Amino acid sequence: RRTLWTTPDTSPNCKMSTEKDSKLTLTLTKCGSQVLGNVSLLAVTGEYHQMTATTKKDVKISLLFDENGILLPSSSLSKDYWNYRSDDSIVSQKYNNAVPFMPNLTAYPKPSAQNAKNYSRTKIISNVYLGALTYQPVIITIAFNQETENGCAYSITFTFTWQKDYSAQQFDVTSFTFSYLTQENKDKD
Amino acid sequence: RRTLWTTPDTSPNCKMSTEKDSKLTLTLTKCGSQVLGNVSLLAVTGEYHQMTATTKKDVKISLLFDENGILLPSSSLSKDYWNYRSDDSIVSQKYNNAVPFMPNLTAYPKPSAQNAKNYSRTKIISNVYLGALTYQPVIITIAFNQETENGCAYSITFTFTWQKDYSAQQFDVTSFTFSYLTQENKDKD
Amino acid sequence: RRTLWTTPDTSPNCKMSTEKDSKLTLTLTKCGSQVLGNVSLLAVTGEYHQMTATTKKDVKISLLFDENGILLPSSSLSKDYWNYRSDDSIVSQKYNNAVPFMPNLTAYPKPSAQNAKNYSRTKIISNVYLGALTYQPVIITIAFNQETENGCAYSITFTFTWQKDYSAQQFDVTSFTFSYLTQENKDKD
Ligand SMILES: CC(=O)N[C@H]1[C@H]([C@H](O)[C@H](O)CO)O[C@@](O)(C(=O)O)C[C@@H]1O
Ligand SMILES: CC(=O)N[C@H]1[C@H]([C@H](O)[C@H](O)CO)O[C@@](O)(C(=O)O)C[C@@H]1O
Ligand SMILES: CC(=O)N[C@H]1[C@H]([C@H](O)[C@H](O)CO)O[C@@](O)(C(=O)O)C[C@@H]1O
C-alpha cells in the first residue's frame, strides 16, 4: 500500500559501528509524486551507545535498493525489519515492488564521469538534536541516488556529522521530516 | 474528513501567558500513516504582545487529547476553535473521533518509570523566526505523547524557547512544517 | 491532477540575475488542505554561476499567479517550464486551473494599508546549503501571497540570502521541503 517502514517496534535493525547496534526508525509515505519521510536513529549497544572523545563524529546509514525498489542485503538496515506497513507491523510477503517509493533518477541522477560535481538538490542538509537537547546539534545529510555500490539502482543515505564532544552520551536524535520526488514506475508482483 | 485545524481566522484561541492572549494557527492533514502538520503562533494581547527584558523565554502550548482523539478542555488551545475543516471554517458537530490524527503510541510512547529517559524521536527540534527576521531565531520543540496530565491518552506540545533579548517586540513566528506517524485506530460517531 | 512542477529536466527556466540563467526545481503536490513543496535552485550561466566578492547576497525568485492559479509571465520562472505533471514531463494543454494549489488567502493575506506589518506565518525561514557543504548556509525565505505586482491574485516567492563570501563558487543549493495551506476553490477548464 502507501507506507514503507521499519515499524517503531521490534529489535535493533541497523549498523552504526557494528552489526545490529542501533534502531533506525524510518517511515516513507507515498503522497503522489512525492514521498513524505520521517527518520530518527538510536544506538542501543556498541561504541555509539556510550561515545568517547575518540568516537568518529560521522555515521552513514545506507539504504541501497534494486531495480524493483527492494532493499539490498548490503544495506546498513537489515531487510528483516523493512517492508510495507500492516497494523503497527509489516506485511508477511517479503519481496514487494516499491518503485513508486524510489527517488526520481532525473531529479536525483547517479553521479557520472561527465558531471564532475553532482547537483546539490540530490541532498537535504539540516540539524537534528542529540538527546533532544537544543545545544547538541547533529548535522543530518540525506542523499538520493548518490551510491553506486553493489549494483544498486537507487539509494537513500542518512549521514550524521557533528563537531561537539558528546563523549559519555548515547547517540539518540530527534525526528526529521523530509520529502523527495519519486520515480514514475509503478508495477507489482 | 482529512484535516483538523484551528482555521486561519476567528479570534484569539490560545494561552501563552493569560487566557485567549494568542492565536495558534495549526493544521493537521492526514496523509495515510503520517500527519503533515503546519504551525505558527502570534501573541495578540498580554505580556507576549510587548515583551520586556524579564519576560520568560519559554512558552509551552499543550494540546491534550482523550482516547477518541478529542481535545481536552485543560489544553492551551480552546476547544471552540478546533475541529475538522469545512469551507475555510470548521464542522458544526462538536465531538468528532480523531484517532487517525493522533501520534502513534509505539513510535511515541508515554514516558515510563522503567525508561528513565524517553526516546529522542518523540521530539522535533528546529528554529522559527520572530517577526520573520532572519537574525531572530526561536527554538521550536514539538513533542508527541510526552504529557500525562489530566488523564490524556495523547498529546502534541509546541514549546518556543529563545536566548536573545526580544524586549519591545510582539511574539509572532514564521510557519513550521512537520510530520509524525499516526495511531492505526480509525473508528467514528 | 495532483502535482504542479518545473520537471527535473529540460533547460534553464529561471532568472536569478539575467534571463534563463538558472534552473529552479520546484514540485508542488496536493495533499488535501495542504501542498507539500520541494524546491532547489542552480545557476547555470551569468553572475551566480561564478560569484565574485561584489555579487549581491540576496536573490528573489517570484512566482506570481492569476485568479485561476496560472503563472503570470512577469514571474522569474518561465511559463513554458511549469505545468501539471505527465510521465517525467508536463501536460500538453497550457492553461490549466490550479486554484487548489494556491496559498490560502485567509492564512496568508495580501499585505494591507490597515495592518502595518503582516503576520509572520506568511513566511517560512530556514537554511539550505551551497554546494551541499555543511559550512555554507544560505537562508531560504518562502513567502505566501506577499506580492501585489502585476495584478497577481496569489504569489509564492523564494528568497535566498547569505552572509559568507562564496566568491568563485557556483550558486547551487540543497533541496528544501515545506508545506502551506491551500485555497478551498477547486474549479477547472
Ligand atoms: C535549535 C538550535 O538552533 N540550537 C543551536 C543552539 C541555540 O541557538 C541556543 O541559543 C543555545 O544552544 O546553539 C548552538 O551553538 C549549540 O548549542 O550548539 C547550535 C545549535 O544548533
Ligand atoms: C536563518 C538563520 O540561520 N539565521 C541565523 C542567523 C544567520 O545565520 C545570519 O547570518 C545573521 O543573523 O544567525 C544567528 O546567529 C542570529 O542571527 O541569531 C542565528 C540565526 O538562527
Ligand atoms: C548544518 C549546519 O547547521 N551548519 C552550520 C555550521 C555547522 O554548525 C558546523 O559545526 C561547522 O560548519 O556552522 C556554520 O557556522 C557554518 O558553517 O557556516 C553555520 C552552518 O549553518
- For domain B1-189, the CATH superfamily is Adenovirus pIV-related, attachment domain (2.60.90.10)
> How far from A55 is each of A61, A130, A162, CA to CA, in Å?
16, 15, 11
Contact list, B11 vs chain C (CB under 8 Å): none
Widest pairwise Cα distance in chain B: 49
> Distance from C17 to chain A by nearest Cα, in Å?
20
Task: For residue C163, report the distance from its CA to the centre of ligand 2, in Å.
Answer: 9
> Distance from C172 to chain A by nearest Cα, in Å?
6
Query: By the 8 A CB rule, do C51 and C168 touch?
Result: yes
- Could you list the beta-strand ranges (E) of chain B: 3-5, 22-31, 34-43, 58-65, 83-86, 89-90, 123-129, 137-144, 154-161, 176-181
Residue linked to cell 546549503: C129
Query: By the 8 A CB rule, do C122 and C110 touch?
Result: no
DSSP assignment of C139-151 equals EEEEEES---GGG
Query: By the 8 A CB rule, do A170 and A43 touch?
Result: yes
| Residue A29: partners with Cβ closer than 8 Å, 6 or more residues away | A2, A3, A35, A36, A37, A38, B31, B32, B33, B34
Query: By the 8 A CB rule, do A68 and A188 touch?
Result: no
Contact list, C135 vs chain A (CB under 8 Å): none
The C-alpha torsion from B111 through B112 and B116 to B117, rounded to 10°, is -20
Query: By the 8 A CB rule, do C166 and C53 touch?
Result: no
| Residue B19: partners with Cβ closer than 8 Å, 6 or more residues away | none
- Inter-chain CB proximity B174 and C34 less than 8 Å: no
Tell me whether C120 touches chain B (CB under 8 Å).
yes
Nearest residue on chain A to B108, alpha-carbon basis: A8
Q: Which amino acid is at A12?
A: P
Residue B91 Cβ contacting ligand 1 at under 6 Å:
no
3-class secondary-structure state, position B174: coil
d(CA A137, CA A153): 32
Give the CA angle between residues A92, A93, A95 to the nearest 5°.
135
The closest CB to that of B31, out of A31, A131, A176, belongs to: A31
Burial class, C47, CB count within 10 angstroms (exposed 0-12 / middle 13-18 / buried 19+): middle
d(CA B24, CA B171): 12
Q: What are phi and psi of B49, to 5 degrees?
A: -75, -25
Contact residues, B window 19-58, toward C, CB-based 8 Å cutoff: 25, 27, 29-31, 36, 38, 40, 42
Give the mutation target among A57, A124, A163 for probing the ligand 3 site: most ligand atoms within 8 A of CB: A163
Elucidation technique: X-ray
> Edge-to-edge, what's the strand order for the sheet holding C176-181?
C89-90, C83-86, C3-5, C22-31, C34-43, C176-181
d(CA A43, CA A138): 14
Q: Give which of B41, B174, B180 to mutate to test C binding, by max C Cβ within 10 Å.
A: B174
Residue spans of the domains in chain A: they are 1-189
Contact list, C31 vs chain A (CB under 8 Å): 31-32, 36
Query: By the 8 A CB rule, do A144 and C38 touch?
Result: no
> Distance from A32 to chain C by nearest Cα, in Å?
7
Cell of residue C15, nine digits: 532568472
- Inter-chain CB proximity A121 and C88 less than 8 Å: no
Query: By the 8 A CB rule, do C28 and C59 touch?
Result: no
- In 3D, which of A92, A102, A122 has the Cα closest to residue A186? A102
d(CA B150, CA B159): 19
Cell of residue B57, nine digits: 523565554
Long-range contacts of B72-80 (CB under 8 A, 24+ apart): B72/B150, B72/B152, B74/B149, B74/B150, B76/B14, B76/B15, B76/B16, B76/B24, B77/B6, B77/B13, B77/B14, B77/B24, B77/B26, B78/B13, B78/B14, B78/B20, B80/B13
- In 3D, which of C110, B130, B94, B120 has the Cα closest to residue A127? B120
Q: Which amino acid is at C17?
A: S
> How far from B36 is each of A181, B27, C112, C180, CA to CA, in Å?
16, 8, 30, 10
- Inter-chain CB proximity A177 and B181 less than 8 Å: no
Cell of residue B120, nine digits: 529522542
Query: By the 8 A CB rule, do B140 and B40 touch?
Result: no
> Distance from B186 to chain A by nearest Cα, in Å?
11
d(CA B181, CA A8): 9
Nearest residue on chain C to A179, alpha-carbon basis: C177
Long-range contacts of C94-98 (CB under 8 A, 24+ apart): C95/C68, C95/C70, C95/C189, C96/C70, C96/C188, C96/C189, C97/C68, C97/C69, C97/C70, C97/C187, C97/C188, C97/C189, C98/C4, C98/C65, C98/C68, C98/C69, C98/C70
Nearest residue on chain C to B40, alpha-carbon basis: C121
Task: For residue A134, report the distance from its CA to the centre of ligand 3, in Å.
Answer: 15
